[PDB]
Amino acid sequence: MRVLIVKTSSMGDVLHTLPALTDAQQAIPGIKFDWVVEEGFAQIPSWHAAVERVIPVAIRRWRKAWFSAPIKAERKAFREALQAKNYDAVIDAQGLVKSAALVTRLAHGVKHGMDWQTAREPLASLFYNRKHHIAKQQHAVERTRELFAKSLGYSKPQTQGDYAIAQHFLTNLPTDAGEYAVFLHATTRDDKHWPEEHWRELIGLLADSGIRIKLPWGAPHEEERAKRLAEGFAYVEVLPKMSLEGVARVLAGAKFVVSVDTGLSHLTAALDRPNITVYGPTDPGLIGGYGKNQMVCRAPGNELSQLTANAVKQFIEENAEKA
C-alpha cells in the first residue's frame, strides 16, 4: 500500500504528523508514505522508516512570481512528481483550502481529509472524496492519528504516539552526547522570547554544575543574541550554522533542552529529548508539545519578563526526575 500525505507547513505541524505514520506502519505491514512538504522541512519526513518519496513545495516563495519562467519550471516539475503515482489513498492532514486546491486536488487516488465541521477551513472539505469527523478538542498529534486510522481502516492505538525519528540519529550521535544541554532562544515574536538577561542568569546558575550549553542560530540576529548569551561563560558554545538535520543531530545528543515556544522545541519533542518550554503569550494547552518528557513552564501573568531564571532552574530541579 502506498499513501500520499499532504501536510506542508509549520515545522511543528509536520512533526506532529509522525506518530500517525508509526501507528499505520504497525497496523499495516509494508505500507509506505510519500509526503508533500514545504522545502524548508523536506528532511523531516525522510527520517521516518515508513516514508519513501518526499515531494517538496514552496508555496509562499512561488507565490511571489508565480508565472515567471523559473517558478513555472519548478511548479511543472512539482505537478509531474505529485501526479506520477496512483495512490491507494491521499490523506490531507492540513485542512486548508490553499493546499487542498493546489495539491490534494491534483493527486491520483481516493482523497481523505477532515470534514466541514472539523477542517481548519470548512471549505477545504469539499476537495476530498472521504470526509472524516475529527474532534477539535485534543492534541494535534492525536487528531492526525485519528485521521490516519479512520482513512486507513484501523483503530487508533491507545498508547502514547511515537514520532519514531530518534532512531535515525541514535546510530550517529555526537561524540559528546549527554554532556550538554541546548537552549533554544529564537522564536517568531517579540513577546514569545525570554529576555536575554534571564537566559544569561539561568546560564550563570549552572556555572558550577559541570554541564556545557550549546546555542543554535539560523539568522544573523539570532547569532548576535547567541553570542551575547554566551559572552563570559566558558562552558557555553555557539554552534556553527547548520542544516535542520544538523541541528536535529545536536538536539538528539542533548541531555535536556530549555526552550521558548518555537519550531525547534517541537523538533526536540519529536526526538524524545527532555525539554522545558517556557510560555508567555501562547497557551501550552492549545499549542504545546507532545512527548511525555516535555515539560511546560508558564510565565507569571503570561509575561515572560516575569519568569525568573531561578524559577526555571527550580522548575528543572523539581522535574529532574522526568529529564
How does DSSP assign 1-13, residue by residue? -EEEEE----HHH
Any idea what DSSP says for residue 36?
Answer: E
CA–CA gap between residue 57 and residue 192 (Å, rounded): 28
Q: Among 163, 178, 212, where does a domain finish?
A: 163
Count of CB atoms situated within 10 Å of the CB of 245? 14
Instruction: Report d(CA 304, CA 301) in Å as an integer.
Output: 8
Among the listed residues 256, 274, 195, 260, the one whose alpha carbon sits nearest the alpha carbon of residue 229 = 195
Same domain for 153 and 193? no
Cα–Cα nearest to 9, from 77, 47, 60: 60
- The string over 21-60, giving b where at least 16 C-beta atoms fall within 10 Å of a residue's C-beta and e elsewhere, is bbbbbebbeebbbbbbbbebbbebbebbebbebbbbbbee
- Solved by what technique? X-ray
Residues pairing with 237 in the sheet: 214
Q: Which of 253, 199, 262 is nearest to 12 (CA)?
A: 262
Do 312 and 247 sit in the same domain of this protein?
yes
Half-sphere exposure of 51 (CA within 13 A, CB side): 24
Nearest to residue 39, comparing CAs of 64, 20, 59, 15? 59
Q: Are residues 149 and 297 in the same domain?
A: no
Give the contacts of 249 (CB within 8 A, at least 6 positions apart): 169, 172, 173, 174
305 C-beta neighbours (distance < 10 Å), count? 15
The residues near 228 (Cβ < 8 Å, ≥ 6 apart) are 196, 200
Q: Rounded CA gap, 35 and 320, in Å?
A: 37
Contact 247, 239 (CB under 8 A): yes
Please identify, among 139, 163, 187, the residue that sits at the C-terminal boundary of a domain: 163
Rounded to 10 degrees, what is the CA torsion of 149, 155, 160, 162?
-40
d(CA 286, CA 20): 19
Shared-domain flag, residues 277 and 187: yes
In angstroms, rounded to a whole number, what is the distance separating the alpha carbons of residues 84 and 19? 26
| CATH code of the domain in which 66 resides | 3.40.50.2000
In a shared domain, residues 98 and 205: no
Say whether both 144 and 233 belong to one domain. no
- Resolution of this model in Å is 1.9
Does residue 108 sit in the same domain as residue 139? yes
- Compute φ and ψ for 112, nearest 5 degrees: -115, 145
